Design a protein around this motif. Structure first.
Motif, short mmCIF file in Angstrom:
data_model
loop_
_atom_site.label_atom_id
_atom_site.label_comp_id
_atom_site.label_asym_id
_atom_site.label_seq_id
_atom_site.Cartn_x
_atom_site.Cartn_y
_atom_site.Cartn_z
N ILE A 8 -4.82 5.85 1.32
CA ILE A 8 -4.54 4.97 0.13
C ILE A 8 -3.78 5.89 -0.97
O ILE A 8 -5.38 6.64 -1.32
CB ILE A 8 -5.22 3.97 0.18
CG1 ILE A 8 -5.23 2.89 1.87
CG2 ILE A 8 -4.42 3.37 -0.95
CD1 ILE A 8 -6.18 1.76 1.60
N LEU A 9 -2.92 5.65 -1.41
CA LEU A 9 -2.58 6.55 -2.85
C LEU A 9 -2.97 5.75 -3.50
O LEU A 9 -3.86 5.75 -5.14
CB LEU A 9 -1.49 7.34 -2.66
CG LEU A 9 -1.53 8.00 -4.75
CD1 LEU A 9 -1.61 9.35 -4.68
CD2 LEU A 9 0.42 8.55 -4.75
N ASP A 10 -2.37 4.36 -3.24
CA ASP A 10 -1.94 2.39 -4.94
C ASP A 10 -2.12 2.48 -4.33
O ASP A 10 -1.46 2.64 -3.35
CB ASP A 10 -0.93 3.39 -6.34
CG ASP A 10 -1.62 2.97 -7.01
OD1 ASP A 10 -2.40 2.15 -7.55
OD2 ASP A 10 -1.33 3.23 -8.05
N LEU A 11 -2.13 1.18 -4.91
CA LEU A 11 -2.06 -0.18 -4.47
C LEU A 11 -0.59 -0.52 -4.88
O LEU A 11 -1.06 -0.75 -6.29
CB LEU A 11 -2.77 -1.90 -4.34
CG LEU A 11 -4.56 -0.98 -2.92
CD1 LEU A 11 -5.29 -2.24 -3.72
CD2 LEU A 11 -4.20 -0.42 -1.75
N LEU A 12 0.35 -1.37 -4.45
CA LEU A 12 1.59 -2.08 -5.18
C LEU A 12 0.88 -3.77 -6.26
O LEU A 12 0.41 -4.38 -5.43
CB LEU A 12 2.66 -2.48 -4.68
CG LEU A 12 3.40 -0.71 -4.60
CD1 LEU A 12 4.19 -0.31 -4.82
CD2 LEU A 12 2.33 0.23 -3.34
N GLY B 111 1.24 -7.07 -7.45
CA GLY B 111 0.97 -8.12 -6.50
C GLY B 111 1.24 -8.34 -4.35
O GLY B 111 1.15 -9.35 -4.99
N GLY B 112 0.83 -7.36 -4.37
CA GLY B 112 1.18 -7.04 -2.83
C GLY B 112 -0.29 -7.46 -2.41
O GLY B 112 -1.59 -8.17 -2.90
N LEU B 113 -0.54 -8.08 -1.19
CA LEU B 113 -0.90 -8.51 -0.35
C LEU B 113 -2.44 -8.00 -0.53
O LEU B 113 -3.41 -8.36 -0.93
CB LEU B 113 -1.48 -8.82 0.79
CG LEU B 113 -0.02 -10.00 1.49
CD1 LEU B 113 0.51 -9.78 3.08
CD2 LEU B 113 -0.68 -10.88 1.78
N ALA B 114 -2.41 -6.33 -0.02
CA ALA B 114 -3.87 -5.79 -0.58
C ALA B 114 -4.28 -5.88 -1.92
O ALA B 114 -5.34 -6.51 -1.76
CB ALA B 114 -3.83 -3.75 -0.11
N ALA B 115 -3.74 -5.68 -2.74
CA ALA B 115 -4.08 -5.61 -4.40
C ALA B 115 -4.61 -7.36 -4.59
O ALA B 115 -6.09 -7.42 -5.09
CB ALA B 115 -3.28 -5.19 -5.10
N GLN B 116 -4.23 -8.19 -3.59
CA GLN B 116 -4.51 -10.00 -3.77
C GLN B 116 -5.80 -9.67 -3.15
O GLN B 116 -6.67 -10.66 -3.89
CB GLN B 116 -3.54 -10.68 -3.28
CG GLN B 116 -2.52 -10.88 -4.46
CD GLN B 116 -1.30 -12.17 -3.83
OE1 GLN B 116 -2.24 -12.67 -2.76
NE2 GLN B 116 -0.34 -11.27 -3.60
N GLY C 28 -8.27 -7.51 -3.26
CA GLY C 28 -8.94 -6.96 -3.89
C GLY C 28 -9.88 -5.41 -3.24
O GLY C 28 -10.92 -4.85 -3.76
N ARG C 29 -9.90 -5.39 -1.95
CA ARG C 29 -11.03 -4.81 -1.63
C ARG C 29 -11.16 -2.88 -0.97
O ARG C 29 -11.08 -2.68 -0.98
CB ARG C 29 -11.46 -5.14 0.34
CG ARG C 29 -12.27 -6.40 -0.07
CD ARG C 29 -12.57 -6.71 1.10
NE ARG C 29 -11.45 -7.42 1.72
CZ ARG C 29 -11.67 -8.42 2.93
NH1 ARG C 29 -12.99 -8.40 3.33
NH2 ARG C 29 -10.45 -8.01 3.63
N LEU C 30 -9.29 -2.75 -0.66
CA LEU C 30 -8.60 -1.68 -0.47
C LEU C 30 -8.94 -0.63 -2.17
O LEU C 30 -8.63 -1.35 -3.01
CB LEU C 30 -7.06 -1.65 0.14
CG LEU C 30 -7.57 -2.41 1.87
CD1 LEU C 30 -6.04 -2.14 1.94
CD2 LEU C 30 -8.46 -0.89 1.76
N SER C 31 -8.83 0.75 -1.88
CA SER C 31 -9.03 1.31 -2.85
C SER C 31 -8.60 2.94 -3.20
O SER C 31 -8.20 3.09 -1.92
CB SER C 31 -10.38 1.59 -3.31
OG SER C 31 -10.40 2.26 -4.52
N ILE D 120 0.97 -0.90 -0.05
CA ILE D 120 0.08 0.07 -0.04
C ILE D 120 0.96 1.10 -0.11
O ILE D 120 1.81 1.44 0.95
CB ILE D 120 -1.01 0.20 0.98
CG1 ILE D 120 -1.66 -1.38 1.13
CG2 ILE D 120 -1.81 1.29 1.45
CD1 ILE D 120 -2.31 -0.98 2.98
N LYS D 121 1.20 2.20 -0.92
CA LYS D 121 1.02 3.53 -0.44
C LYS D 121 0.20 4.69 -0.17
O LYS D 121 -1.00 4.82 0.15
CB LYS D 121 1.40 4.45 -2.34
CG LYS D 121 2.19 5.40 -2.21
CD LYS D 121 2.49 5.94 -3.43
CE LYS D 121 3.33 6.58 -3.58
NZ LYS D 121 4.06 7.03 -4.68
N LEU D 122 0.61 4.86 1.18
CA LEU D 122 -0.42 5.75 2.06
C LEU D 122 0.48 7.56 2.24
O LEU D 122 1.79 7.55 2.42
CB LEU D 122 0.28 5.57 3.57
CG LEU D 122 -0.52 3.72 3.88
CD1 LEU D 122 -0.15 3.69 5.19
CD2 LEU D 122 -1.76 4.31 3.25
#
Length: 95
Positions: A33-37, A39-44, A46-49, A20-22
């Motif tokens: 949250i600016l963006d998710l990296l 392949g990372g956990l957060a992206a996997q 799928g809920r955070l935006s 996560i980029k905070l």
């Protein structure tokens, strides 16, 4: 309006990042949250935006927090990282 969500991520080892980029903003308090990296956990998960506000992590208040404070909490966490989120605004607008 805003939606309040809770998202739980699970660290495979104690040094795993969340992906996560905070950021802070100068015109309003909080940590966002600016963006998710890729392949990372957060992206996997799928809920955070992008543009979500992080209100709390593991019961620790972040309403008036900073990215550094969030980093401290996350780096010291146990395996489970629970984020409480606020997601503002309309997802679709005709203009």
């Amino acid at each position: 309006s805003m939606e309040i969500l809770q998202v739980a991520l699970h660290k495979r080892d104690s040094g795993e990042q969340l992906g996560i980029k905070l950021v802070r903003r100068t015109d309003e308090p909080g940590v966002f949250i600016l963006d998710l990296l890729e392949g990372g956990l957060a992206a996997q998960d799928g809920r955070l935006s992008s543009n979500d506000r992080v209100l709390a992590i593991n019961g620790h208040d972040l309403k008036y927090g900073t990215p550094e404070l969030a980093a401290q909490i996350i780096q010291a966490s146990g395996e489970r990282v629970n984020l409480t989120i606020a997601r503002p605004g309309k997802p679709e607008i005709e203009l």
